[PDB]
């Protein structure tokens, strides 16, 4: 029927305890999502190469070249985490809950409408809307994965977060093999360096089309379409932070001497010559036991070099590491690599009042000190002669090749079979959920973007399309455009992504870190006297755990 | 070293067959454990991972010239980026799943 | 794990042993940049403090069950079961010159 | 390296990637460990050194 | 802080933080617990994986 | 077979630097005490342990 | 054990085939001599992620 409705709204969070402290947490989500016909219906190869920019030397990281397929299709994705949750939910959750288990996701379209557009032309300008009973919205679901996974979080392109703002997909286009020379350069370099663009070779072409890779489905204004639910296999997300590094691991030194009134001067000293105690290091030429050469189980953490840009056949690009500076909570000045900054506009957190193109940034501090203070690293020789000297130690106030802004922590790797290291924290609203596993034999550890890792195969991307409405004057012999009644789509999409949590219990008897709302975040969450909304940043991991 | 010495002999370790003119021997069916073993290249790197920038300007003619451009100044971009002490992103800046 | 500070039981059954003064790592922040004979002045050699956010203090009593023995009482623990792998006693020599 | 005479490249040098075959530590009697717990981290490391 | 402040000592950092229990522990997880010279020679000469 | 680690390098994080562990220590340091250098374990310990 | 291929893509993907650069390399000489050129494994491309 024309006039029956085909789905109900949905966007309530229900947490259903359960026994043995779990609770299956059901976040449902509703969207009016808005689809305009595409630009053209044809598959376009496009080639970006802005040579302007890095042709200035001292530029190179600043190289936008690719190639990309630019789709008439466009793509509906919910994988961010201001899809599912309010920022009440969200507390609820990280603050009452350990861990948290993807279980299962769906998504359905409903209500479908289409409509047209006609223009008077007459002096004073003036045009009008009118439903097609008999128009189609072109609906395809790549279950099988045969498309690029293209996981729009990464652009701050998926759904509004705002239950009650409309919202809409994002263009579908992926890329395309090119081949890329750019060597680096700095200010006062010669001439210029090699800044080529090769083309494409012929073993690496991969040309996708939905039309001829996936079902696609003509719905009407009566017409609805469900995915079916799909069951995640990804490993447990921990919501608790670890804080010991490798000086916090074991049994520490006995004090054989104890501060006999409290203060905050009074220290307790040891009271064992450095070279006369007893334990265990790994340093085998020398005596010295002291928290900085007792033997620890492991490494946490790991050494990388940082600002590294590594370049293979598409070009140069930044070597990822799994965490960012330890102890940079207090200053976003101080974040340095690693922590993930995110940029973002009124869609998906941004005062939804503000005006102009610049977006709104933050950088996650994470709670969990896996991480390094490069200032701090030294080598010196293996005869560790105390205290050192000039000739034995490599300060990281060294220059390495003689530049002054350079030292060997920049070089400096040691991941070794010794390290131990922790999965990305959920990032709250703008982070994604799920991401891919990657199709290589052999596998990384972990993923930068995602909390949870699809160990097999992971929901199928969602695609529409407004059906071409053609005009009578269409001849296909013809190189021009093709005419198209101008169409376009408002469409309730909903979905429900299931979770699995247990519920935390208190092991200390000092009280833990929460969310709170407090008078210098009271206006964060409520909307504005023009009905402006913005939602920041959430943490994840605020309660302590213990690693050892 | 001593202790690293290994010295093998076929006659004490392993069981001789002697075989005549009339004689054959058969190994028997060996059954292996093998991981797969895939008969196809990945050509993607770091820079051809995920959702490509949308692209404001496309070009209108065809030709080796004519590129397409993103539209958008670097620092006003929005994404994600493991650089977090710096507004730009890029394609050689922008955060990729893994390496 | 007493062993990395020789803190475990002794080794000989005819001696008696004493157990240890059982302590725990708190949670500090401590930067010492580095230095050679010949540096100026004084690096910053700073301690900060605990971030309250990774404070944990555990105590036994309200955590563990406490029995108390008296003169003529027993405790045992009960046996526990591993799931370690396994251990060698024979090394490898070759290395990547003896290698085929 | 660095201009420092006693600090060479092999100092600060890695050689760890996907190729390298190790060992794990021989027990040490008597002052050794027999058992360690396993960090509770997400991705652990592949032994133990104590 | 006085043994740190001399310029180049920085290996021999000791500095932390301890929670200091009335409790004690009793540790049986050593090599010498168990086993005499006598038995360890028996178990390495004539063993080969544990 | 092994790997090469940045031995003797101290990695600075929250709590202050520590000596980067490494699984193995030197080849050929069986003929010669002087050379134990990293990696190979020193045991200090006292009357009730040897 | 083996499993044969799809095409996931509009384009033809590489392959490998004998031609008249290559022809020779594949049949005995007029003396008998014969000759095994190196030949690619990985010619089809693949998704990675």
């Known amino acids: 029927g024309v006039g029956i409705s085909t789905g109900t709204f949905n966007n309530q969070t229900e947490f259903k305890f359960l026994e043995n402290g779990w609770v299956y947490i059901t976040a449902n989500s509703s969207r009016l999502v808005h689809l305009n016909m595409p630009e053209s219906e044809n598959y376009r190869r496009v080639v970006v190469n802005n040579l302007d920019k890095t042709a200035v030397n001292g530029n190179m990281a600043l190289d936008d070249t690719h190639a990309e397929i630019v789709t008439p299709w466009s793509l509906v994705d919910a994988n961010a985490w201001g899809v599912w949750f309010n920022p009440g939910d969200w507390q609820l959750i990280v603050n009452t809950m350990s861990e948290l288990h993807l279980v299962s996701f769906e998504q359905e379209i409903f209500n479908v409408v289409l409509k047209t557009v006609s223009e008077s032309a007459t002096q004073p300008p003036t045009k009008v809307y009118n439903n097609d009973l008999t128009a189609s919205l072109m609906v395809a679901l790549d279950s099988n994965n045969t498309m690029p996974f293209t996981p729009a979080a990464m652009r701050s392109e998926t759904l509004g977060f705002y239950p009650w703002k409309p919202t809409i997909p994002t263009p579908w286009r992926y890329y395309f093999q090119w081949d890329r020379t750019l060597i680096p350069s700095h200010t006062g370099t010669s001439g210029t360096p090699t800044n080529i663009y090769h083309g ?56 054989n001497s104890l501060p006999q009134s409290e203060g905050g001067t009074n220290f307790g000293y040891i009271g064992v010559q450095q070279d006369k105690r007893r334990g265990v290091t790994q340093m085998g030429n020398t005596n010295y036991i002291t928290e900085a050469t007792i033997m620890r189980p492991a490494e946490v953490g790991y050494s990388a070099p940082y600002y590294s840009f590594e370049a293979s056949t598409q070009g140069p690009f930044k070597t990822p590491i799994a965490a960012g500076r330890g102890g940079a909570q207090t200053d976003e000045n101080q974040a340095a690599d690693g922590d993930p900054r ?15 193109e610049t977006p709104e940034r ?22 560790f002669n105390l205290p050192v000297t000039d000739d034995n130690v490599l300060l990281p106030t060294d220059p390495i090749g003689g530049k002054t802004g350079i030292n060997y922590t920049n070089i400096f790797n040691t991941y070794g079979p010794l390290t131990a290291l922790n999965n990305v924290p959920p990032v709250y609203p703008n982070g994604q959920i799920w991401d891919k596993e990657f199709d290589t034999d052999l596998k990384p550890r972990l993923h930068v973007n995602a909390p949870f890792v699809c160990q097999n195969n992971c929901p199928g991307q969602l695609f529409v399309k407004v059906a071409p409405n053609l005009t009578n004057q269409y001849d296909p012999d013809a190189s021009a455009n093709m005419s198209r009644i101008v169409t376009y789509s408002d469409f309730w999409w909903k979905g429900k992504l299931v979770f699995k949590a247990k519920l935390r219990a208190s ?42």
Not at 347 to 355: A, I, L, P, S
Request: aromatic share 14%; net charge neutral.
């Open 362 to 383: 933050f950088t996650y501090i994470a709670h969990q000190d896996t991480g390094r203070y490069p200032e701090g690293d030294w080598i010196q020789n293996i005869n």
């Open 342 to 356: 995110y940029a973002f506009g009124r869609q998906h957190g941004q005062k939804t009042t503000t005006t102009g």
């Open 200 to 255: 494409t070779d012929p073993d690496d072409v991969q040309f996708y089309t939905i039309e001829n890779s996936v079902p696609v489905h003509l719905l009407r204004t009566g017409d609805e379409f469900a995915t079916g639910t799909f069951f995640f296999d990804c490993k447990p997300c921990r919501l608790t932070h670890t804080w010991q590094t490798n000086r916090a691991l074991g049994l520490p030194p006995f004090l």
């Open 507 to 548: 092991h200390t008897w000092n009280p833990i870190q929460q969310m709170s709302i407090n008078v210098d975040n009271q206006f964060n969450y409520v909307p504005s006297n023009i009905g402006g909304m913005k939602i920041v940043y959430e943490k994840s991991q605020l309660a302590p755990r213990k690693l050892y």
